[PDB]
Amino acid sequence: PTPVEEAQQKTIEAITKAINYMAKRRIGALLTIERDTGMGDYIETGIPLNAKVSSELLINIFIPNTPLHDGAVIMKNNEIAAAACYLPLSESPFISKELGTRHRAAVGISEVTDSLTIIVSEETGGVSVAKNGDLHRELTEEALKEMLEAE
Amino acid sequence: VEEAQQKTIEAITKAINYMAKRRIGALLTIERDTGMGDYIETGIPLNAKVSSELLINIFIPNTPLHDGAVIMKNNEIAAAACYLPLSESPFISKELGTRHRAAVGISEVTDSLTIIVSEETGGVSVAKNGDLHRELTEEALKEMLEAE
Numbered sequence: 454p455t456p457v458e459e460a461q462q463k464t465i466e467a468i469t470k471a472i473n474y475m476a477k478r479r480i481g482a483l484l485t486i487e488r489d490t491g492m493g494d495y496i497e498t499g500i501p502l503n504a505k506v507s508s509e510l511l512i513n514i515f516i517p518n519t520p521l522h523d524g525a526v527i528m529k530n531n532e533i534a535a536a537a538c539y540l541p542l543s544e545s546p547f548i549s550k551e552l553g554t555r556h557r558a559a560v561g562i563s564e565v566t567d568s569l570t571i572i573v574s575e576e577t578g579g580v581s582v583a584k585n586g587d588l589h590r591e592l593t594e595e596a597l598k599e600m601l602e603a604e
Numbered sequence: 605v606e607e608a609q610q611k612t613i614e615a616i617t618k619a620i621n622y623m624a625k626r627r628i629g630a631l632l633t634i635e636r637d638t639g640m641g642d643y644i645e646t647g648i649p650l651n652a653k654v655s656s657e658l659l660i661n662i663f664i665p666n667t668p669l670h671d672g673a674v675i676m677k678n679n680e681i682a683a684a685a686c687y688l689p690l691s692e693s694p695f696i697s698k699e700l701g702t703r704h705r706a707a708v709g710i711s712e713v714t715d716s717l718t719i720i721v722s723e724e725t726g727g728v729s730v731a732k733n734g735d736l737h738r739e740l741t742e743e744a745l746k747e748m749l750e751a752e
């Protein structure tokens with residue numbers, strides 16, 4: 454495998470381990486992965502980190518009642534670019550009415566970028582992904598990892 | 605460069621103040637001229653920009669990153685949850701535990717400056733040159749960082 458491919462696999466493993474940990478504990482999370490549409494405008498609304506990814510940092514970021522836990526984490530490749538970022542809120546009628554701001558923000562950014570956003574519900578622990586204006590809910594650990602590997 | 609150093613000092617002091625008030629244990633070593641790569645390598649790599657918010661989030665109790673030392677280098681957070689050597693000095697106050705002994709320990713073999721927040725009292729101390737300077741005010745800590 455090339456170094457880029459191995460680095461990508463490490464990042465996926467870090468993300469999936471963090472998301473799985475948060476889902477089990479009902480830790481709300483909002484994690485947007487930049488793709489080909491640049492997200493600089495939104496990255497600049499948060500606290501800059503420019504940090505190497507780890508499952509441990511991702512978890513620490515979203516612990517409730519902490520400085521960094523509200524708003525989105527935005528990733529660029531293997532790095533956490535910024536935390537506590539603003540994303541636009543979708544007005545889509547296909548967002549389940551019981552869902553809160555994190556899900557509406559994820560769908561919102563997915564309507565104006567090709568990014569992939571992962572959401573952990575603080576109510577249920579359910580894991581969802583927003584992509585291209587669609588929200589896919591109640592993902593298994595395997596489905597999430599397969600979505601990341603495919604993207 | 606001067607504006608960047610002051611920004612980092614302000615970020616550190618704001619984080620330390622927050623933790624001291626809440627009696628959140630913390631251990632933050634600032635590399636100086638003695639390289640500490642061997643200890644940085646024992647932690648979780650971050651190479652992150654300093655912010656008060658990131659420092660606070662690192663040290664929250666019962667989280668992956670809160671046990672061990674944060675090591676700063678070249679104005680960034682190099683790693684978290686790092687190992688530091690424990691001092692065997694018999695002249696550390698006996699009521700103090702592992703965090704303070706680790707800060708003194710790294711200070712015995714490097715020129716680094718380490719900041720400790722006690723989880724028992726929220727007291728703020730600094731280890732340098734093998735000595736621990738205890739019960740620091742906000743102003744005293746700022747003076748040490750500026751002097752360093």
Ligand SMILES: O=C(NC[C@@H]1CCCO1)NC1CCCC1
Pocket residue numbers: 456457460461462464465486528529530531601
């Ligand atoms: O693009 C990289 N990782 C991408 C991750 C995979 C899962 C979400 O984003 N790493 C390359 C840039 C730095 C070295 C290779």
Ligand SMILES: O=C(NC[C@H]1CCCO1)NC1CCCC1
Pocket residue numbers: 605608609610612613634676678679749
């Ligand atoms: O921010 C600091 N140095 C900045 C360097 C890199 C860019 C320009 O010079 N040092 C801080 C750490 C401890 C207290 C001050």
Ligand SMILES: [Mg+2]
Pocket residue numbers: 590591
């Ligand atoms: Mg379904």
